[PDB]
Amino acid sequence: MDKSELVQKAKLAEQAERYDDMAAAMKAVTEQGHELSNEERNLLSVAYKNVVGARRSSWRVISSIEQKTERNEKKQQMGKEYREKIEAELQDICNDVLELLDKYLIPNATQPESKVFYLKMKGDYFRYLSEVASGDNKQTTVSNSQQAYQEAFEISKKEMQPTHPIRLGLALNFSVFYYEILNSPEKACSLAKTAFDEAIAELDTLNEESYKDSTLIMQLLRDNLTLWTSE
Amino acid sequence: MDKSELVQKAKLAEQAERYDDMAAAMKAVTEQGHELSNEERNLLSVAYKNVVGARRSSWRVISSIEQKTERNEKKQQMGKEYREKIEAELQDICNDVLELLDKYLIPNATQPESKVFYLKMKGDYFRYLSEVASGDNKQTTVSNSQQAYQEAFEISKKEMQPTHPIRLGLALNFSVFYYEILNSPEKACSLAKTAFDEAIAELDTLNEESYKDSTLIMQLLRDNLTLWTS
Numbered sequence A: 001m002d003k004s005e006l007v008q009k010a011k012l013a014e015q016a017e018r019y020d021d022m023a024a025a026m027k028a029v030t031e032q033g034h035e036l037s038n039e040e041r042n043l044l045s046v047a048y049k050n051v052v053g054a055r056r057s058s059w060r061v062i063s064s065i066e067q068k069t070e071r072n073e074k075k076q077q078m079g080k081e082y083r084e085k086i087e088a089e090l091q092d093i094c095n096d097v098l099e100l101l102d103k104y105l106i107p108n109a110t111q112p113e114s115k116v117f118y119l120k121m122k123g124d125y126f127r128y129l130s131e132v133a134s135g136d137n138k139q140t141t142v143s144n145s146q147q148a149y150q151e152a153f154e155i156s157k158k159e160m161q162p163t164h165p166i167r168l169g170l171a172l173n174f175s176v177f178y179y180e181i182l183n184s185p186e187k188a189c190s191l192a193k194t195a196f197d198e199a200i201a202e203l204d205t206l207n208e209e210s211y212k213d214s215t216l217i218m219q220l221l222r223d224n225l226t227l228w229t230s231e
Numbered sequence B: 001m002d003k004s005e006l007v008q009k010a011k012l013a014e015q016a017e018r019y020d021d022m023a024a025a026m027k028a029v030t031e032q033g034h035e036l037s038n039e040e041r042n043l044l045s046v047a048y049k050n051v052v053g054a055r056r057s058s059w060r061v062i063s064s065i066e067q068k069t070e071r072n073e074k075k076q077q078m079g080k081e082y083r084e085k086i087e088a089e090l091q092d093i094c095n096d097v098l099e100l101l102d103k104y105l106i107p108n109a110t111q112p113e114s115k116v117f118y119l120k121m122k123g124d125y126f127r128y129l130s131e132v133a134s135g136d137n138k139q140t141t142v143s144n145s146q147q148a149y150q151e152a153f154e155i156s157k158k159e160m161q162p163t164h165p166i167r168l169g170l171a172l173n174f175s176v177f178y179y180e181i182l183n184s185p186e187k188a189c190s191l192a193k194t195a196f197d198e199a200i201a202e203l204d205t206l207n208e209e210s211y212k213d214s215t216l217i218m219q220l221l222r223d224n225l226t227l228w229t230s
Helices: A003-015 A019-030 A038-068 A074-108 A112-132 A135-160 A165-181 A187-200 A212-229 B003-016 B018-030 B038-067 B073-108 B114-130 B135-161 B165-180 B185-201 B209-227
Strands: none
Touching: A003 A019, A003 A112, A003 A187, A003 B038, A003 B073, A019 A074, A019 B114, A038 A074, A038 B003, A038 B073, A038 B209, A074 A112, A112 A135, A112 A165, A135 A165, A165 A212, A165 B018, A187 A212, A187 B073, B003 B038, B003 B165, B018 B038, B038 B073, B038 B114, B073 B114, B073 B185, B114 B135, B135 B165, B165 B185, B165 B209
C-alpha cells in the first residue's frame, strides 16, 4: 500500500474503532520518511493514544484486582502473570512510538511547531513507560521524560512568542511535571511564574478577537501558582 | 493448564475488556473435552459474542461508508479491501465457534438445557456467517442456521418451561432470524407470538433467580411483535 492508501485505511480503521489497525497504518506512513501533514500527524497521535490507553486501562484494572485479593490464593498468581503480559504489550507499543520519533519524526521536522509536538510526544510516552517500570529502570524513564520535555521547552522559548498557545501549554504541563513527578514545588512555581509573567508582558499585542487562545491557559498557570504557593 | 486457572484468566480478561484473550481461554477450556458448568458456558458465550460483535459493528460501519458516493477509485478500493479483511476475520471467528460446537459442546451435552443453549449458539453463528456470505454459500449458511434453531426449538418446547430464559432467548433470536434473514414477517410473528403467549399463560413457572432475565426477554418479544405488526 502507498501513502494515499495507508492514510485512507487509517481513517477507515478509526471509524470502525480498530485502533491497532489505525496505528499500524500510520506507522507505515511515518516510515516513508517524509514530514507529516497536520492531518497525518493527528491520525498518528490519535491512533497511538488509543492503543496505549486501552492497555493502560487494562493494566490499572488488573492491578486493582491484584491489590484486593488474598495473598496466597492462585488468583493472586494469575493476576500477576496477566498483569505482566499487559505490561510487556504496553512497553512494546511505547517503544514503537519512541522509535518512530527518534528515527523519523524529530530529526526530519523543519518547523519548530512540529519539533515541539514530537518532543512532547516523546516525553509523554516515556511517562507511560514510567507507570509500569520497576527498579532503577523507573528513575531512568522519568529522566528521559524530563529531557524530552526540556528540549521541547527550550525550542518553544526560542522560536515562539510568550503568548503562543503551544508555548503556554508546554509551560503548564512541564511545571506540573515538576510539581507532581519530580516533587520539586519551588522549581515548578518558578517555571509557571516565569511563563505567566512573560505572557502578561505581551498582552497588549494580542488581537481582541482571539486573545482567549492565550489567556485561558495563562489563567491555569496562575491558578496553579496560587495553589502551590498556599502549600 | 488447569480449568480453574483458565477460567480465572477469562474472568480477568473480561474485567480488562480484553475479549480476544477471554475467548482464547474459554476455547482452551472447551478443548479439554468435558461438559462445561453453567458459569463456564456463559463465559464462553459472552467472550465470543463480544469478539464477533466488535467485528460485526466494524463491518456495518465500513459497509455504510462504502455506500456513500466516492469518486476516487483508490479510496473505493481501500474500503472494499478493508471490508473484505473484516469479513475474513468474522468468518474465522464463526468457524472457530462452530467447530467447538460440533466437535465438543453439542455431542457431549447430557442435559436438554445445554443442548438447546448450544444449538441456539449454532443458529446464531451460522446467521452471522450468512450476513457476509455470497452465492451458494449464502443459501447454505442460512439453511444451516434455520435447521439449528429448529432443532433447538423442538427440544426446548419438550424439555423446558416457557418462561425459561434460554427458551425465550431462542424464540427471540429465531423469530428475528425469520424477520431479518429469511424476510418472512408471517413466520417471525407466529413464532414470537406463540412464545410470548406460552410464557404469560404459565406465570407460575417464573422463579426468583431468573425473573428479571425472563421478563426482559418477554418484553423484547412483545416490542418486536408490536413493531412487525405496525
